[PDB]
Amino acid sequence: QAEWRSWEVNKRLEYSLVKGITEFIEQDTEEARQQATRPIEVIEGPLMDGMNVVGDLFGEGKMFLPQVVKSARVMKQAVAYLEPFIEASKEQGKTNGKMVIATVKGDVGDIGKNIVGVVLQCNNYEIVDLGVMVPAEKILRTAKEVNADLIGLSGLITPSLDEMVNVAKEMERQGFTIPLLIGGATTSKAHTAVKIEQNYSGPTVYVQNASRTVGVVAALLSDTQRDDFVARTRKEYETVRIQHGRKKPRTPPVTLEAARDNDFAFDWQAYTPPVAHRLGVQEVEASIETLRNYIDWTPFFMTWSLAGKYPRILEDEVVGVEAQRLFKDANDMLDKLSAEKTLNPRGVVGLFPANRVGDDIEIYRDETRTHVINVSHHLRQQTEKTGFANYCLADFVAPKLSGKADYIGAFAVTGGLEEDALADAFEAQHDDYNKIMVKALADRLAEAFAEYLHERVRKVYWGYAPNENLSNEELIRENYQGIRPAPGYPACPEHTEKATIWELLEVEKHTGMKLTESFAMWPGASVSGWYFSHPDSKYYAVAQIQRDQVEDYARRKGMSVTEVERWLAPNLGYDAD
Ligand code: B12
């Protein structure tokens, strides 16, 4: 009764490590301890060798992320046993290097940084994760104290880009010398070479994914390829730098007043917006069982680095089988979470009477539309357009002057407040696998709540599409009437606008959701936005706007021209200043 459970205790570890088995991992690492001269030996011995096998099958394309991080669980759960033994010992082993990783200040994204983290650990590297929303002061202070070999920053939203710039400028002022690694959603080879590097004398390198990271950190910590690398990189960032400064034959921008004039052309007198069936703010609720169906799995696989749209991905050649397994692993947790009620999604919805006024939407106390209680600000496209209107989300709402009764909604949902706790429980058991899963699922559940809610709105709450019966795939295709733009996307860049959503719906109190200094939401698995009904509305990108609109927007927002320039950095069609 065994078979594999009968080879050399070292052939067992190295094996269980690859296959990712954890039910003999305790006694297998123990027996290999008593049989070793000193604790640390089991590390560079069976464990080390085993991991290499993973890195190998990884490159050939046999193993994928899911397994790698699943093997990491073994690697870690093993060491976790060798803590006292490896500690109460003499020389306690070496590493390929130590790195301080952190999600920049004001940002809450971390799954990606987690992936990059574990991967680097599966390559015998020390990683001190400083978590999220970490000030550059802490990052550096820590890099100093722990004497890290390099610093790595991660970001998801726009505010983050500037924050990384800060850290660069800081490391430069504090006379740092180690290389600065930058990554995450918003980070791009472009921005990392036109708005960051020129701030730090040390080597600043951008990296697209966890995989390539090991490559970069390799040379960067190599007494050989280091110079050659940085040199090629510096000269490489210079090229992309001048290329993003050739000012190609673009279309001449237009004045703010010129744009507004070419606003959405629509006969409002002949049109009568659908009246809101249920005005006011309500707290909505849906179980995991209710939202699963509304989950869009394609993104989920992307989080585990398995390309291919779902479900076509399941029958894929190269990564089909693993995709199948991950999905199954995923759903089993959802079944658990749904049963035990350990993760409960929450949300608040609200419909209000409104009307358009310029590039803004006026929210009123009641239907008498005599008292403005809030104002949704929006920007407008400022490129010379012909035959097409200079799009603005506000245009899709009947203007005060048209005397037409129009409306606007707002929402805020989450996969559950417990997201953070559930993950911590895993970190505690050195289970990064399930830790990454719960967060990935929390997110899939948040977005699902979003889809579900928007439906319940069109159908019930706002009730303009009662006879709507679209399929999950059609929902993914957005094949319904009306949009639900969310502050952050190109349709509405201004992030600080989520404040108005919090104020209006009283998010904090109905869901427990909050906003941070950088206007980030917590829990991370969170979605908030508006609800337009107009059948001609779309997610038109604001694009590059000019100085005149910034000043004007600044006046309506009651913010400093400098402030809005920070928040709308990515859309500054003029000299960023
Ligand atoms: C999952 C996701 C979410 C989640 C939560 C994320 C979280 N908080 O963990 C949900 C659905 C809940 C969500 C919400 C929001 N989202 Co969102 N989201 C995504 C999405 C669909 C997928 C990509 C993804 O995030 N990948 C998994 C991650 C975390 O991996 P990664 O970051 O890409 O990491 C890889 C590398 O970059 C690298 N890496 C990571 N860090 C580091 C560090 C170092 C040092 C190194 C070398 C490498 C490295 O390794 C990874 C490879 O393994 C994208 C679309 C897209 N395709 O870009 C938008 C996107 C990132 N989201 C966006 C925005 C607009 C929002 C919201 C503001 C919307 C709202 N509701 O109001 C909020 C976020 C605020 C909040 N919650 O606090 C934008 C950002 C635009 C911007 N503003 O600059 C995007 C690009 C969408 C768009 N088209 O505009 N989102």
XYZ file of C-alpha atoms and ligand atoms in Angstrom:
668
model
C 0.000 0.000 0.000
C 2.221 2.874 -1.254
C 4.664 2.603 -4.184
C 6.014 6.123 -4.465
C 5.756 6.210 -0.692
C 8.716 3.851 -0.679
C 11.679 5.480 -2.454
C 14.480 7.494 -0.873
C 12.943 10.147 1.379
C 14.697 12.680 -0.920
C 13.289 11.277 -4.187
C 9.868 11.611 -2.513
C 10.232 15.296 -1.627
C 11.652 16.324 -4.997
C 8.745 14.350 -6.468
C 5.894 15.628 -4.270
C 7.283 19.123 -4.891
C 6.733 18.837 -8.641
C 3.443 17.001 -8.536
C 2.404 19.486 -5.876
C 1.418 17.019 -3.161
C 0.959 18.033 0.463
C -0.099 15.169 2.719
C 3.283 13.574 3.383
C 5.160 16.854 3.111
C 5.494 17.012 6.895
C 7.029 13.589 7.597
C 8.897 13.544 4.278
C 10.826 16.695 5.131
C 11.270 15.423 8.692
C 12.750 12.063 7.744
C 15.016 13.873 5.300
C 16.138 15.983 8.250
C 17.218 13.268 10.661
C 19.091 11.716 7.730
C 20.862 14.969 6.878
C 23.993 16.320 8.537
C 22.362 19.718 9.047
C 18.862 21.205 8.390
C 19.779 23.521 5.506
C 20.912 20.513 3.442
C 17.316 19.417 2.762
C 16.878 22.846 1.193
C 19.475 22.926 -1.623
C 19.100 19.140 -1.777
C 15.708 17.489 -2.594
C 13.720 20.747 -2.508
C 16.073 22.874 -4.632
C 16.454 20.089 -7.201
C 12.695 19.574 -7.323
C 11.976 23.227 -8.025
C 14.440 23.232 -10.893
C 12.439 20.471 -12.492
C 9.452 22.845 -12.399
C 11.393 25.740 -13.874
C 12.456 23.309 -16.612
C 9.030 21.953 -17.558
C 7.905 25.580 -17.275
C 10.121 26.824 -20.082
C 9.398 23.939 -22.428
C 5.735 24.797 -21.891
C 4.745 21.633 -19.996
C 3.923 23.284 -16.635
C 1.990 26.518 -16.178
C 1.477 29.144 -13.488
C -1.258 27.255 -11.587
C 1.021 24.281 -10.955
C 4.182 26.318 -10.298
C 2.450 28.232 -7.516
C 0.959 24.902 -6.441
C 4.459 23.464 -6.107
C 5.472 26.579 -4.264
C 3.019 25.485 -1.605
C 5.083 22.373 -1.067
C 8.395 24.220 -1.150
C 7.073 26.637 1.474
C 5.134 24.250 3.688
C 8.392 22.276 3.874
C 10.594 25.127 4.971
C 7.861 26.145 7.416
C 8.765 22.903 9.179
C 12.495 23.574 9.048
C 12.109 26.962 10.745
C 13.421 26.015 14.203
C 15.834 23.382 12.866
C 17.301 25.657 10.180
C 17.399 28.501 12.702
C 19.018 26.730 15.673
C 21.695 25.798 13.116
C 25.055 27.170 12.015
C 25.314 28.726 8.521
C 21.665 29.253 7.556
C 21.952 29.148 3.761
C 22.234 31.798 1.057
C 19.919 33.284 -1.578
C 20.127 34.501 -5.161
C 19.209 37.843 -3.687
C 16.745 39.821 -1.575
C 14.019 42.089 -3.011
C 11.521 44.506 -1.435
C 8.226 44.353 -3.332
C 5.315 46.692 -2.650
C 2.166 48.039 -4.252
C 2.778 51.740 -4.578
C 1.070 54.336 -2.401
C -2.671 54.881 -2.792
C -3.043 51.659 -4.769
C -4.729 48.425 -3.716
C -3.975 45.937 -6.497
C -1.873 43.013 -5.420
C -2.715 39.718 -7.128
C -0.192 40.502 -9.856
C 2.482 41.474 -7.311
C 1.658 38.240 -5.506
C 2.205 36.185 -8.670
C 5.534 37.966 -9.403
C 6.432 37.408 -5.769
C 5.884 33.638 -5.558
C 7.575 33.111 -8.917
C 10.689 34.890 -7.707
C 10.639 32.754 -4.563
C 10.502 29.605 -6.667
C 13.867 30.835 -7.922
C 15.467 31.058 -4.465
C 15.087 34.790 -3.903
C 14.168 36.636 -0.708
C 10.971 38.662 -1.026
C 9.738 41.058 1.626
C 6.235 42.109 0.503
C 5.319 45.468 2.039
C 1.676 45.016 1.017
C -0.452 47.732 -0.633
C -0.745 51.498 -0.302
C 2.816 51.687 0.916
C 4.456 55.151 1.069
C 7.782 55.547 -0.718
C 9.248 56.363 2.700
C 8.440 52.896 4.005
C 9.653 51.263 0.819
C 13.054 52.929 1.029
C 13.345 52.819 4.768
C 12.741 49.053 4.458
C 15.057 48.575 1.511
C 17.728 50.183 3.706
C 17.057 48.221 6.902
C 16.749 44.800 5.252
C 19.547 45.731 2.872
C 17.655 44.620 -0.218
C 19.340 44.051 -3.550
C 16.585 45.782 -5.477
C 13.208 47.479 -5.085
C 10.070 46.552 -6.993
C 6.922 48.649 -7.364
C 3.480 47.569 -8.541
C 0.472 49.565 -9.701
C -2.984 49.111 -11.181
C -4.706 52.485 -11.626
C -3.502 55.805 -13.044
C -2.702 57.601 -9.777
C -0.037 54.934 -9.263
C 2.185 55.997 -12.201
C 3.055 59.301 -10.483
C 3.629 57.522 -7.203
C 6.331 55.377 -8.836
C 7.882 58.542 -10.247
C 8.085 59.767 -6.675
C 9.912 56.666 -5.465
C 12.354 57.032 -8.338
C 13.032 60.701 -7.502
C 13.306 59.728 -3.885
C 15.790 56.929 -4.337
C 17.770 59.510 -6.353
C 17.697 62.104 -3.601
C 18.456 59.571 -0.894
C 21.540 58.501 -2.828
C 20.283 54.954 -3.410
C 22.089 52.796 -5.893
C 20.201 49.474 -6.333
C 18.033 48.886 -9.456
C 14.360 49.884 -9.437
C 11.935 47.347 -10.913
C 8.497 48.551 -11.946
C 5.403 46.569 -12.995
C 1.657 45.998 -12.793
C -1.334 46.897 -14.976
C -0.741 50.602 -15.738
C 3.023 50.273 -16.032
C 4.258 50.382 -19.639
C 7.670 50.264 -21.386
C 6.732 53.728 -22.595
C 5.855 55.479 -19.342
C 8.701 53.748 -17.530
C 11.047 55.368 -20.038
C 9.589 58.825 -20.444
C 8.436 59.618 -16.955
C 10.480 57.556 -14.511
C 14.039 56.547 -15.462
C 15.244 60.094 -16.094
C 14.643 60.657 -12.345
C 16.963 58.016 -10.923
C 20.669 57.614 -11.665
C 20.368 53.931 -10.838
C 19.041 51.258 -13.266
C 15.253 51.456 -13.570
C 13.808 48.526 -15.493
C 10.211 47.852 -16.525
C 9.018 44.239 -16.881
C 5.863 42.864 -18.519
C 5.262 39.720 -16.433
C 6.427 37.567 -13.523
C 8.155 35.204 -15.938
C 10.463 37.795 -17.514
C 11.121 39.235 -14.059
C 13.367 36.344 -13.121
C 15.337 37.217 -16.243
C 15.782 40.872 -15.369
C 16.589 40.243 -11.724
C 19.044 37.618 -12.940
C 21.264 39.955 -14.922
C 20.659 42.763 -12.451
C 22.079 40.552 -9.719
C 24.733 39.111 -12.035
C 28.376 40.207 -11.786
C 28.452 39.887 -15.583
C 25.302 40.755 -17.523
C 24.512 43.621 -15.120
C 26.422 46.364 -16.917
C 25.581 44.961 -20.352
C 21.886 44.840 -19.406
C 21.457 48.320 -17.890
C 23.462 49.731 -20.770
C 21.242 48.115 -23.395
C 18.189 49.090 -21.391
C 19.236 52.725 -20.971
C 19.931 52.996 -24.704
C 16.698 51.138 -25.343
C 14.576 53.510 -23.238
C 16.213 56.412 -25.102
C 14.961 55.126 -28.442
C 11.365 54.659 -27.286
C 11.713 58.051 -25.634
C 12.396 60.033 -28.786
C 9.895 57.923 -30.702
C 7.135 59.120 -28.317
C 8.146 62.680 -29.158
C 8.005 62.809 -32.966
C 4.514 64.368 -32.903
C 3.245 62.522 -35.988
C 0.741 64.176 -38.387
C -2.080 64.033 -35.813
C -5.440 65.758 -36.099
C -5.362 69.374 -34.758
C -7.106 69.593 -31.373
C -10.135 71.860 -30.958
C -11.138 74.510 -28.396
C -13.284 73.570 -25.420
C -16.083 75.773 -26.728
C -15.662 74.356 -30.225
C -16.038 70.830 -28.836
C -19.064 71.563 -26.659
C -20.691 73.122 -29.715
C -20.269 69.920 -31.687
C -21.997 68.009 -28.887
C -24.231 64.968 -29.366
C -26.958 65.839 -31.870
C -30.313 64.461 -30.720
C -33.944 65.643 -30.905
C -34.885 65.648 -27.253
C -38.350 67.030 -27.870
C -39.368 63.924 -29.808
C -37.720 61.607 -27.249
C -39.016 60.896 -23.754
C -36.509 59.162 -21.439
C -37.767 56.112 -19.561
C -39.009 57.121 -16.115
C -37.317 55.502 -13.147
C -39.628 52.903 -11.657
C -37.856 53.083 -8.323
C -36.206 56.341 -7.252
C -33.997 56.478 -4.178
C -31.134 54.541 -2.605
C -31.541 50.854 -1.796
C -29.207 48.206 -0.459
C -29.040 45.217 -2.820
C -27.982 41.668 -1.998
C -27.109 38.519 -3.940
C -25.510 35.243 -2.860
C -22.551 33.552 -4.501
C -25.051 31.022 -5.905
C -26.964 33.862 -7.544
C -23.883 35.572 -9.038
C -21.833 32.594 -10.279
C -23.819 32.486 -13.511
C -22.990 36.142 -14.100
C -19.251 35.539 -13.668
C -17.105 36.168 -16.735
C -14.339 33.602 -16.552
C -12.104 34.869 -19.356
C -10.418 37.464 -17.095
C -9.910 34.820 -14.385
C -7.753 32.626 -16.590
C -5.790 35.719 -17.646
C -5.000 36.201 -13.946
C -3.398 32.765 -13.939
C -1.607 33.422 -17.224
C -3.660 31.052 -19.389
C -4.544 32.819 -22.634
C -7.748 32.146 -24.488
C -11.324 33.199 -24.166
C -13.574 31.007 -22.072
C -14.978 28.480 -22.730
C -13.085 27.972 -25.998
C -10.015 27.816 -23.741
C -11.063 24.505 -22.132
C -10.700 22.612 -25.399
C -7.449 24.324 -26.288
C -4.464 22.184 -27.204
C -1.498 23.501 -25.191
C -3.240 24.886 -22.102
C -6.657 23.295 -22.415
C -6.342 20.600 -19.739
C -4.799 22.840 -17.092
C -7.397 25.521 -17.792
C -9.969 22.812 -17.113
C -8.392 21.910 -13.815
C -8.015 25.517 -12.577
C -11.660 26.162 -13.404
C -12.673 23.056 -11.451
C -10.423 24.042 -8.551
C -12.007 27.495 -8.749
C -15.622 26.307 -8.644
C -15.039 23.929 -5.750
C -13.995 26.960 -3.638
C -16.998 28.911 -4.811
C -19.091 25.951 -3.692
C -17.394 26.093 -0.321
C -17.666 29.840 0.062
C -21.312 29.747 -1.016
C -22.141 26.972 1.441
C -20.294 28.151 4.529
C -21.150 31.798 3.816
C -17.500 32.769 4.370
C -17.511 35.339 1.558
C -20.664 37.428 1.152
C -21.045 39.948 -1.682
C -22.724 43.264 -0.889
C -23.966 46.235 -2.821
C -25.922 49.452 -2.868
C -27.872 50.900 -5.823
C -29.458 54.287 -6.445
C -31.561 56.067 -9.050
C -31.981 59.865 -8.967
C -33.754 62.570 -10.999
C -31.249 64.394 -13.228
C -30.760 66.617 -16.263
C -27.867 67.767 -18.364
C -26.196 71.171 -17.999
C -23.125 71.621 -20.157
C -20.732 68.761 -19.587
C -22.300 67.960 -16.247
C -25.326 66.120 -14.841
C -27.473 67.748 -12.132
C -28.848 65.408 -9.460
C -32.043 66.627 -7.732
C -33.619 65.931 -4.326
C -36.954 64.814 -5.832
C -39.050 64.980 -8.994
C -39.888 68.673 -8.569
C -36.327 69.195 -9.727
C -36.079 72.379 -7.722
C -33.024 71.585 -5.550
C -29.716 70.293 -6.920
C -28.245 67.922 -4.297
C -25.122 66.828 -6.242
C -23.409 67.216 -9.627
C -21.839 64.499 -11.781
C -18.903 66.051 -13.633
C -17.759 64.779 -17.016
C -15.178 65.703 -19.607
C -15.589 65.985 -23.397
C -13.506 64.852 -26.377
C -11.385 67.722 -27.591
C -10.197 66.516 -30.978
C -11.351 68.138 -34.216
C -14.171 65.792 -35.189
C -16.169 65.913 -38.434
C -19.386 64.003 -39.059
C -19.112 62.772 -35.485
C -19.921 64.583 -32.240
C -17.265 65.405 -29.635
C -18.658 62.772 -27.277
C -19.407 63.507 -23.594
C -21.278 61.177 -21.220
C -23.384 64.115 -20.139
C -24.839 64.489 -23.658
C -26.715 61.200 -23.178
C -28.902 62.865 -20.567
C -31.785 65.217 -21.350
C -30.793 68.844 -20.654
C -32.576 71.012 -18.090
C -33.766 73.244 -20.974
C -35.364 70.370 -22.925
C -37.674 70.207 -19.918
C -37.571 66.419 -20.325
C -37.543 64.273 -17.205
C -34.383 62.159 -17.395
C -32.628 60.073 -14.734
C -29.250 58.721 -13.608
C -28.132 55.820 -11.467
C -25.112 54.804 -9.415
C -23.856 51.592 -7.860
C -21.220 50.097 -5.593
C -20.696 46.351 -5.214
C -18.092 43.988 -3.699
C -17.323 40.250 -3.689
C -17.382 40.471 0.063
C -15.778 42.308 2.928
C -14.156 39.105 4.123
C -11.892 38.921 1.067
C -8.912 40.269 3.033
C -9.425 37.956 6.001
C -9.872 34.751 3.990
C -6.664 35.438 2.111
C -4.691 36.226 5.317
C -5.792 32.832 6.625
C -4.096 31.275 3.594
C -0.909 33.379 3.840
C -0.835 32.083 7.389
C -0.802 28.494 6.138
C 1.709 29.333 3.374
C -1.038 28.590 0.833
C -0.442 31.230 -1.853
C -2.424 29.108 -4.283
C -5.734 29.337 -2.513
C -4.770 32.799 -1.431
C -4.568 33.968 -5.030
C -7.765 32.028 -5.810
C -9.954 33.610 -3.154
C -8.892 37.077 -4.344
C -9.363 36.164 -7.998
C -12.806 34.777 -7.205
C -13.684 37.725 -5.012
C -12.943 39.920 -8.065
C -14.934 37.663 -10.436
C -17.782 37.902 -7.978
C -17.525 41.685 -7.738
C -17.745 42.127 -11.524
C -20.501 39.556 -11.575
C -22.436 41.541 -8.953
C -21.938 44.490 -11.293
C -23.456 42.648 -14.294
C -26.266 41.192 -12.271
C -27.140 44.587 -10.701
C -27.068 46.484 -13.947
C -29.468 43.873 -15.269
C -31.801 44.077 -12.287
C -31.728 47.838 -12.928
C -32.669 47.784 -16.642
C -35.237 45.131 -15.845
C -36.670 46.037 -12.418
C -35.303 49.115 -10.605
C -35.096 51.504 -13.532
C -37.321 49.100 -15.440
C -36.860 50.276 -19.050
C -36.061 46.811 -20.368
C -38.487 44.528 -18.491
C -38.738 42.073 -21.382
C -34.982 41.542 -21.367
C -33.689 37.980 -21.380
C -30.058 37.991 -22.513
C -27.609 35.161 -21.910
C -24.491 35.485 -19.838
C -22.428 35.515 -23.035
C -24.626 38.274 -24.460
C -24.218 40.239 -21.226
C -20.415 39.918 -21.666
C -21.068 41.312 -25.139
C -22.859 44.336 -23.633
C -25.832 43.596 -25.928
C -28.362 45.546 -23.815
C -29.725 49.127 -23.648
C -27.646 51.617 -21.676
C -24.150 51.714 -20.137
C -22.659 51.693 -16.610
C -19.448 53.716 -16.849
C -17.189 53.632 -13.814
C -14.763 56.404 -12.766
C -11.376 55.273 -14.015
C -12.123 53.914 -17.491
C -11.433 56.039 -20.631
C -15.117 56.989 -20.759
C -14.544 58.993 -17.532
C -10.841 59.341 -16.427
C -11.483 61.486 -13.374
C -11.132 59.102 -10.442
C -12.080 61.467 -7.639
C -15.608 61.195 -9.031
C -16.175 58.033 -7.013
C -16.517 60.353 -4.018
C -19.826 61.617 -5.391
C -20.928 58.026 -5.740
C -19.984 57.346 -2.128
C -21.726 60.459 -0.911
C -24.893 59.832 -2.987
C -25.410 56.167 -2.171
C -23.864 56.268 1.301
C -21.661 53.305 0.333
C -19.607 53.123 3.516
C -22.741 52.583 5.612
C -24.758 50.174 3.424
C -21.884 47.925 2.389
C -18.879 48.730 4.493
C -16.902 49.725 1.396
C -14.439 52.640 1.651
C -12.179 54.939 -0.359
C -8.527 55.704 0.089
C -6.428 58.833 -0.299
C -5.949 57.912 -3.962
C -9.676 57.189 -4.211
C -9.189 53.440 -4.335
C -11.897 51.112 -3.083
C -11.764 48.518 -0.351
C -12.272 45.660 -0.473
C -10.112 45.332 -3.557
C -12.856 43.235 -5.163
C -15.006 46.330 -5.653
C -16.854 48.012 -8.508
C -18.697 51.355 -8.478
C -20.058 53.491 -11.304
C -23.068 55.200 -12.875
C -26.042 54.091 -14.974
C -27.178 55.847 -18.138
C -30.232 54.673 -20.030
C -30.060 56.465 -23.380
C -30.119 53.890 -26.158
C -27.376 55.798 -27.954
C -24.840 55.843 -25.167
C -21.433 54.216 -25.406
C -18.116 54.080 -23.679
C -16.552 56.834 -25.800
C -13.011 57.621 -24.640
C -12.383 61.183 -23.506
C -8.886 61.047 -25.082
C -6.463 63.971 -24.892
C -7.966 67.178 -23.576
C -6.489 70.680 -23.619
C -5.616 73.328 -21.005
C -8.853 75.255 -21.432
C -11.001 72.293 -20.327
C -8.695 71.519 -17.395
C -9.113 75.043 -16.008
C -12.853 74.921 -16.626
C -13.151 71.457 -15.060
C -11.086 72.773 -12.165
C -13.644 75.528 -11.626
C -16.598 73.168 -11.633
C -14.849 70.625 -9.395
C -13.613 73.412 -7.182
C -10.087 72.007 -7.378
C -6.692 73.484 -8.108
C -5.670 73.407 -11.743
C -2.618 71.545 -10.506
C -4.722 68.944 -8.669
C -6.912 67.961 -11.613
C -3.724 67.797 -13.711
C -2.540 65.013 -11.396
C -5.747 63.046 -11.660
C -6.055 63.505 -15.388
C -2.358 63.062 -16.189
C -2.985 60.372 -18.861
C -5.385 62.685 -20.716
C -3.302 65.873 -20.775
C -3.191 66.722 -24.453
C -0.737 69.472 -23.602
C 2.674 69.780 -21.977
C 2.324 67.939 -18.671
C 2.918 70.766 -16.174
C -9.140 41.944 -12.042
C -9.345 43.603 -12.522
C -10.078 44.397 -11.503
C -10.686 43.908 -10.039
C -9.741 44.160 -8.698
C -8.228 44.313 -8.790
C -7.566 44.366 -7.427
N -7.909 45.364 -6.797
O -6.766 43.385 -7.165
C -12.084 44.473 -10.097
C -13.151 43.796 -11.047
C -12.820 44.262 -8.714
C -11.652 45.916 -10.608
C -12.042 47.158 -10.118
C -11.556 48.366 -10.614
N -10.895 48.558 -11.869
Co -9.959 47.129 -12.849
N -9.128 45.789 -14.127
C -8.978 44.290 -13.893
C -8.691 43.822 -15.403
C -10.061 43.237 -15.948
C -7.697 42.637 -15.611
C -6.114 42.637 -15.494
C -5.551 42.382 -14.101
O -5.817 43.255 -13.222
N -4.666 41.357 -14.092
C -4.182 40.602 -12.965
C -3.062 41.562 -12.169
C -3.316 42.260 -10.755
O -1.724 41.230 -12.945
P -0.880 42.442 -13.512
O -1.158 43.642 -12.762
O -1.199 42.625 -14.877
O 0.539 41.853 -13.177
C 1.337 41.301 -14.137
C 2.516 42.186 -14.472
O 2.107 43.544 -14.618
C 3.528 41.825 -13.411
N 3.778 42.688 -12.224
C 2.914 43.058 -11.252
N 3.464 43.864 -10.352
C 4.806 43.834 -10.607
C 5.930 44.445 -9.830
C 7.316 44.254 -10.300
C 8.274 44.814 -9.493
C 7.592 43.464 -11.541
C 9.022 43.280 -12.225
C 6.444 42.871 -12.294
C 5.044 43.083 -11.817
O 3.270 40.465 -13.160
C 2.026 40.088 -13.527
C 2.290 38.898 -14.477
O 2.131 37.867 -13.717
C -8.259 45.055 -16.161
C -8.266 45.055 -17.745
C -6.929 44.962 -18.416
N -6.962 44.063 -19.243
O -5.970 45.709 -18.078
C -8.806 46.354 -15.442
C -8.130 47.626 -15.250
C -6.604 47.304 -14.521
N -9.051 48.285 -14.164
C -9.226 49.662 -14.256
C -10.084 50.535 -13.515
C -10.730 51.762 -14.333
C -10.884 49.993 -12.301
C -11.827 50.666 -11.157
C -11.435 52.182 -10.850
C -13.357 50.733 -11.705
C -14.624 51.144 -10.667
N -15.309 50.200 -10.222
O -14.778 52.380 -10.399
C -11.633 49.758 -9.961
C -10.395 49.701 -8.923
C -10.344 50.476 -7.541
C -10.552 49.643 -6.429
N -11.173 48.592 -6.383
O -10.046 50.012 -5.376
C -8.212 50.067 -15.431
C -7.095 51.133 -15.046
C -7.275 52.473 -15.797
C -6.718 53.557 -15.078
N -7.518 54.157 -14.388
O -5.494 53.839 -15.180
C -8.018 48.856 -16.312
C -6.673 48.834 -17.230
C -9.337 48.950 -17.252
C -9.492 49.988 -18.457
N -9.752 49.566 -19.579
O -9.347 51.211 -18.260
N -10.589 45.712 -11.626
